[PDB]
Amino acid sequence: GIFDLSGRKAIVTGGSKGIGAAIARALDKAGATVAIADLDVMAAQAVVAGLENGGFAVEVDVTKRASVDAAMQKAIDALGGFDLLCANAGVSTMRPAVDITDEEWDFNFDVNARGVFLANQIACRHFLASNTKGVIVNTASLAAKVGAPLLAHYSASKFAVFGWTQALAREMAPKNIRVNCVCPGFVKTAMQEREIIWEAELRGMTPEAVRAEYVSLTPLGRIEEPEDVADVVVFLASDAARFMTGQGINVTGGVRMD
Amino acid sequence: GIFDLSGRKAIVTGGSKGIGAAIARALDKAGATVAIADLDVMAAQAVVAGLENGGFAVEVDVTKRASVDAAMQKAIDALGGFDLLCANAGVSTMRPAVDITDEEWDFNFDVNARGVFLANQIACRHFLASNTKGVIVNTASLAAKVGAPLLAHYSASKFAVFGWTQALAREMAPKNIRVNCVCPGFVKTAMQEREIIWEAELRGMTPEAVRAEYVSLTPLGRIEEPEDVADVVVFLASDAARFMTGQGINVTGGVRMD
Amino acid sequence: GIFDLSGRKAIVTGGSKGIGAAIARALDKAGATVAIADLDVMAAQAVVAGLENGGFAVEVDVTKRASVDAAMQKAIDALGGFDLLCANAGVSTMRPAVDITDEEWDFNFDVNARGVFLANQIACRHFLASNTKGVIVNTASLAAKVGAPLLAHYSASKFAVFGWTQALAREMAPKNIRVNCVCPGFVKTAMQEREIIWEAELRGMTPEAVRAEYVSLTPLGRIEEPEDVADVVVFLASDAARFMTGQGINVTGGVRMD
Amino acid sequence: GIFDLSGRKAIVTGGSKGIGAAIARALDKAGATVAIADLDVMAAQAVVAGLENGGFAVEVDVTKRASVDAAMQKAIDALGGFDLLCANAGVSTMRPAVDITDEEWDFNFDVNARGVFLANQIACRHFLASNTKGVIVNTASLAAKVGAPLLAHYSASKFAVFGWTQALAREMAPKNIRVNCVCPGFVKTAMQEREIIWEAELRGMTPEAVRAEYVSLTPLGRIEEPEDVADVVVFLASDAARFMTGQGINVTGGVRMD
Numbered sequence A, B, C, D: 001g002i003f004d005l006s007g008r009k010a011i012v013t014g015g016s017k018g019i020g021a022a023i024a025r026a027l028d029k030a031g032a033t034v035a036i037a038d039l040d041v042m043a044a045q046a047v048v049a050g051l052e053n054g055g056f057a058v059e060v061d062v063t064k065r066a067s068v069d070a071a072m073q074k075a076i077d078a079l080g081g082f083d084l085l086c087a088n089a090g091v092s093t094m095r096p097a098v099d100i101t102d103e104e105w106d107f108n109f110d111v112n113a114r115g116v117f118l119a120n121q122i123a124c125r126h127f128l129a130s131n132t133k134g135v136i137v138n139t140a141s142l143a144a145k146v147g148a149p150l151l152a153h154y155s156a157s158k159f160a161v162f163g164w165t166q167a168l169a170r171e172m173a174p175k176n177i178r179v180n181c182v183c184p185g186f187v188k189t190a191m192q193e194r195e196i197i198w199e200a201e202l203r204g205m206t207p208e209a210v211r212a213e214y215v216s217l218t219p220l221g222r223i224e225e226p227e228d229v230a231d232v233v234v235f236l237a238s239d240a241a242r243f244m245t246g247q248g249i250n251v252t253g254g255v256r257m258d
């Protein structure tokens, strides 16, 4: 029925692990055929090896236009079509705002904001040229809704993703192309493992005291899983969401309400 | 599946027509057994007659605590259980702010805000007594996000639904109970058909010109249908939305982005 | 100066004590002549007596249209004019959401939401009749932006003030009338003193531990004063805010950012 | 008065013309001594000649750390102090989203986001080294709140300013440093004059049809002047705004309500 993705062809950037790998598995379960584009091709291959409908693994660096152009064309050729882009790749570093370096400012913006711009822009050109009712889902963040201390540069780059998402949605809507983002909470991935260590170091706490504090900040009372985000991305990709565009959907267990 | 409602027991207030009827039908199609509570029990039984998984129709006036309490108990008894509430009943009148009467202020607040309060409160008491991981979806409005001219009292009452939703969601979260709302845009039902002719008069326009304006204000390029909303209500009821609570989900065709 | 209110005629509802009393004193200091309409006229008379520019105290119950109509006319007649309304009167009770009584629901909505509706509606009728560049500032709350546990009914009533404010602002803007609201944080008045007791009992804490928690939740690191709110109300009344209408200005010391 | 800026030492980036020059003039009128830092140092000298309290003109390119560091030190030395930064420099280009170039992507982010980051970060270092209760006001945009078609890249960069502002505010509040931003609507400057010609060409309209459309979207019913923004910046800089930080204050004439 209306949540079904049978026959559709999807690309997921940053799909080798964490949230992106969960997105790839959820799209596949819902009936899609999935290409994963990532820095880490061998992990991408291992995810694909477990998919029902097959799929494809390609190397990409989302910071570079020429890499995104080539990886997307390669994926599209392999898939035999293109209906859906999940632009999920992202990074962070943690620093007091007064100490943020230009190198880490650029690192955060070029993956998180420019990475989404390039994948989205190139996807829309392909949708328009094939006359496809394409769909996009971007992975933003809680930090796209509320600026986070020690992550002031990461917050700025995730606000940028959400603004991009809204403006692109307005331009794409008369073409019947939808564009939304999800804003996850405290998701237990390798990113969380890093950030609890960084926060613990900066605050003079233990890493597990820091992870306990995340849970205590979450009304639903548990740490978030990649799968909590992935099932929402499937909804946003599907015809159940046909009258929804330019949204930043919170998946945070009650931390943020919009 | 994670989008399905197989075996769930649901109550829909205001389920006899328009958005609420489409909600009852969507819940049923997803696998739920549905009780409809409405002022118009004959129209309610008519919707129930076409459902796949059975169902039940009961009389209710959502403005009155004794009525809500008796209807809810009767519906639960008939269902053999209770997992889901969709509090959808609602009304409007259009009028210049300077001319709003106390009678129409009360009409809007008593059905829209008080009606959601009473059905939500009594539902939560039932969920808690049974240790049920209960779910609520309230029908709010685009007018809960942006104040609308000629609907100042209507806007206030819908903002109230949204405020109630967030606060209740914060209290119910540690009890494993979720509470969200949907904010529909311009929906083709008898509320719209009423509204458009009266809006035209007040604005010194023709009714086809007013309708045409709603279309051009919608990025996705069409009038909204009750099914556009009902499918989003199914997702919010389902385990795919298990990590989402206290939200106001826009279903407006891109008119509003949050 | 563009912040000067010299020669202007103001009505403050709820101006007898706390925030309202601070608002009346700040408007007066900025050059206005101020009438205070309050349920406690003895206290209102004491505030008015100490004002630099004259003024008038009148008894009002903002829950009742006949009271608001009569008190507003009496104040306007005494002032010899009418330029500015600050509708500040408000109440609260605290209760778990599943225990909220109909009486306390009505108590909160009739004062907070209806009281603002009546005062604003009647003010606009006066402004329009005399071709006045009128201004309204409403006192909403932090709980108009974020649902507060134990204050679910209070939250819904304050969300309603904010929704009313936006819709009325859209209708009045073509007529040279502005309408905004302020959203205060944890302000040290009699309301706070009552609430910290109720909250301590409900949460099993001490009253001062509850107050300490408010402070720890506030980035600027101190409890709020009525004067912190009053000076922003002066701004919103003034010609410096001439291009601002329909806003909810947060005054919370960084607790909420919009 | 609480709106007085007597004795305070202010730096304005992008103060040579438009909104920035209006800000510089308004701060000086309020009692501040003003240094203007701009790409056009001859235009900054023109503005300083009309200030009551004297002032200083210094060349800066806000895209380059070395330039910002040097200009700010020069300004602070000239002023004999440093209490207030208004980071106002900004640029735009217009383009359909599918045609946006990497060059103009970089142009928008480097001035608008990075320019604010650099001036803000360096200012906080100086405030902290001197134990100063510093204040910052950033010039964001309506496009920091709503994604704008043809300005998708410009929107993203301005959302970035707003997120940066929130996160920095959270870090700076315990040090008694305030950080807010303003979000102007359709302001009559050379940027507007440029944008109406570009927009008219991309849409197949006249420039005066485009202008008329901005006005008809504005509830106050007129095009905005730079002074409508500058007087709000004076408020945000002053002790009247002492309990306000991390906000995006709309100055749009009712276009956007938050």
Ligand SMILES: NC(=O)c1ccc[n+]([C@@H]2O[C@H](COP(=O)([O-])OP(=O)(O)OC[C@H]3O[C@@H](n4cnc5c(N)ncnc54)[C@H](O)[C@@H]3O)[C@@H](O)[C@H]2O)c1
Binding pocket: A013, A014, A015, A016, A017, A018, A019, A020, A037, A038, A039, A040, A060, A061, A062, A063, A088, A089, A090, A091, A111, A139, A140, A141, A142, A183, A184, A185, A186, A187, A188, A189, A190, A191, A192
């Ligand atoms: N974990 C959280 O709490 C959390 C919260 C909110 C948002 N997010 C966001 O969700 C997304 C996924 O994060 P995650 O937690 O799963 O992190 P992760 O580090 O586990 O996964 C990141 C993936 O993106 C890929 N990647 C990184 N840079 C790339 C580049 N230049 N080109 C191509 N691929 C690249 C990595 O190889 C990896 O497969 C990111 O956009 C992140 O900002 C995470």
Ligand SMILES: NC(=O)c1ccc[n+]([C@@H]2O[C@H](COP(=O)([O-])OP(=O)(O)OC[C@H]3O[C@@H](n4cnc5c(N)ncnc54)[C@H](O)[C@@H]3O)[C@@H](O)[C@H]2O)c1
Binding pocket: B013, B014, B015, B016, B017, B018, B019, B020, B037, B038, B039, B040, B060, B061, B062, B063, B088, B089, B090, B091, B092, B111, B112, B139, B140, B141, B142, B183, B184, B185, B186, B187, B188, B189, B190, B191, B192
């Ligand atoms: N249609 C729109 O344009 C639109 C837009 C935004 C929000 N909404 C909201 O969506 C919901 C449904 O709107 P609709 O257009 O389908 O309206 P409708 O009038 O077609 O149906 C409303 C249903 O609520 C019931 N109802 C009314 N008062 C009741 C009471 N006191 N007790 C029990 N039942 C009562 C009616 O009998 C009816 O079945 C409402 O909450 C409405 O405010 C509608």
Ligand SMILES: NC(=O)c1ccc[n+]([C@@H]2O[C@H](COP(=O)([O-])OP(=O)(O)OC[C@H]3O[C@@H](n4cnc5c(N)ncnc54)[C@H](O)[C@@H]3O)[C@@H](O)[C@H]2O)c1
Binding pocket: C013, C014, C015, C016, C017, C018, C019, C020, C037, C038, C039, C040, C060, C061, C062, C063, C088, C089, C090, C091, C092, C111, C139, C140, C141, C142, C183, C184, C185, C186, C187, C188, C189, C190, C191, C192
């Ligand atoms: N104290 C806080 O922490 C806080 C926070 C957010 C919002 N507020 C809001 O600020 C406003 C003032 O609160 P306060 O703390 O100064 O409270 P308070 O209890 O000290 O004063 C309320 C004032 O309103 C008047 N009032 C009450 N009912 C009235 C009626 N029916 N008619 C006319 N006057 C009536 C009272 O006589 C009193 O003068 C209220 O609207 C309140 O909801 C307070």
Ligand SMILES: NC(=O)c1ccc[n+]([C@@H]2O[C@H](COP(=O)([O-])OP(=O)(O)OC[C@H]3O[C@@H](n4cnc5c(N)ncnc54)[C@H](O)[C@@H]3O)[C@@H](O)[C@H]2O)c1
Binding pocket: D013, D014, D015, D016, D017, D018, D019, D020, D037, D038, D039, D040, D060, D061, D062, D063, D088, D089, D090, D091, D111, D139, D140, D141, D142, D143, D183, D184, D185, D186, D187, D188, D189, D190, D191, D192
């Ligand atoms: N005009 C509007 O309608 C509008 C609306 C929203 C936001 N804004 C924002 O307001 C601010 C000013 O806009 P304006 O309309 O006055 O524009 P403008 O083009 O008139 O002036 C911009 C000023 O910034 C300076 N500048 C540009 N690049 C610089 C650099 N690299 N280093 C130092 N100085 C530089 C210019 O020399 C100029 O003095 C910008 O941040 C803009 O994005 C304007």
